[PDB]
Structures are given as structure tokens and as C-alpha cells.
Amino acid sequence: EGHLFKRASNAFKTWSRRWFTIQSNQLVYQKKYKDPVTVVVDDLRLCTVKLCPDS
Amino acid sequence: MTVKLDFEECLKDSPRFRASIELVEAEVSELETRLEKLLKLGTGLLESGR
């Protein structure tokens, strides 16, 4: 669990800081503390993770 | 024109949205001129080839 930057629904795709948890083969993100989390990937085991050298 | 836009600024009445919607209507006004010139110029081509 820990803070990561991600791209928001601002028109430029403006980057922004949120607290993320990996659990039960899943990646969620927190919306506010104690309020329920949102899914990022349904299952990480059908995922690929790209180091992305062209960003 | 802007490249790939999303809703926050749009609904919060941002000046960035507002100048960005201004600048695409002008690109579409340019675009239409370039189309009708291409239409008449390719019409003259087709006539010149026939």
C-alpha cells in the first residue's frame, strides 16, 4: 500500500496523487479515507506492466 | 486544436476550456474552406483529365 501519481479527467490529463493498495490479486485506489475504494484493474493476473520508455 | 479533452474544467467553467472551445471552431472554419477549395480544384482536375 502507498501513494502514486495517476492521470485525472482534466482535459490535459493532469497528473495527481492518490493512495493505492494491492490486495487479493487486485489494484485499488482510495477516493477519501474510510470511504470505499475504486478498482484500477479487476485482476492483476491478466495484467502486463509496462515500463513505458516513450512517456 | 486540443488533443484528447475531458470533463472537469468544462463543468467548472474553466477559462482553459473556454479558449479551447474558441480555438477549435476556428480550426473547423479553416477546415471547411480547405475542403471547398479541394472540392473545386479536384473538380477541375477531373474535367481536365476527361
UniProtKB/Swiss-Prot annotation, chain B:
Effect after changing residue 14 to A: No effect on interaction with ITGB1
Compartments, record wording: Recycling endosome membrane
The record's account of tissue expression is:
Highest level in lung and spleen. Low level in heart, kidney, liver and pancreas.
Would you say which domain of life the source belongs to?
Eukaryota
- Summarize subunit and interaction data from the UniProt record for this chain: Banana-shaped homodimer laterally assembling into tetramers, the tetramers further pack helically onto the membrane. Interacts with GTP-bound ARF6. Interacts with third cytoplasmic loop of SLC2A4/GLUT4. Interacts with CLTC. Interacts with GULP1. Forms a complex with GDP-bound ARF6 and GULP1. Interacts with ITGB1; required for ITGB1 recycling.
- Report the protein's function: GTPase-activating protein (GAP) for ADP ribosylation factor 6 (ARF6) required for clathrin-dependent export of proteins from recycling endosomes to trans-Golgi network and cell surface. Required for regulated export of ITGB1 from recycling endosomes to the cell surface and ITGB1-dependent cell migration.
What more is known?
A: Cells overexpressing ACAP1 show an accumulation of ITGB1 in recycling endosomes and inhibition of stimulation-dependent cell migration. Cells with reduced levels of ACAP1 or AKT1 and AKT2 show inhibition of stimulation-dependent cell migration. Cells overexpressing ACAP1 and PIP5K1C show formation of tubular structures derived from endosomal membranes.
Domain remarks in the Swiss-Prot or TrEMBL record: PH domain binds phospholipids including phosphatidic acid, phosphatidylinositol 3-phosphate, phosphatidylinositol 3,5-bisphosphate (PIP2) and phosphatidylinositol 3,4,5-trisphosphate (PIP3). May mediate ACAP1-binding to PIP2 or PIP3 containing membranes. Only one PH domain of one ACAP1 dimer inserts into the membrane, while the other PH domain acts primaryly to interact with adjacent ACAP1 dimers. The BAR domain mediates homodimerization, it can neither bind membrane nor impart curvature, but instead requires the neighboring PH domain to achieve these functions.
* Record protein name field: Arf-GAP with coiled-coil, ANK repeat and PH domain-containing protein 1
Q: Which organism is it from?
A: Homo sapiens
Q: Which gene encodes it?
A: ACAP1
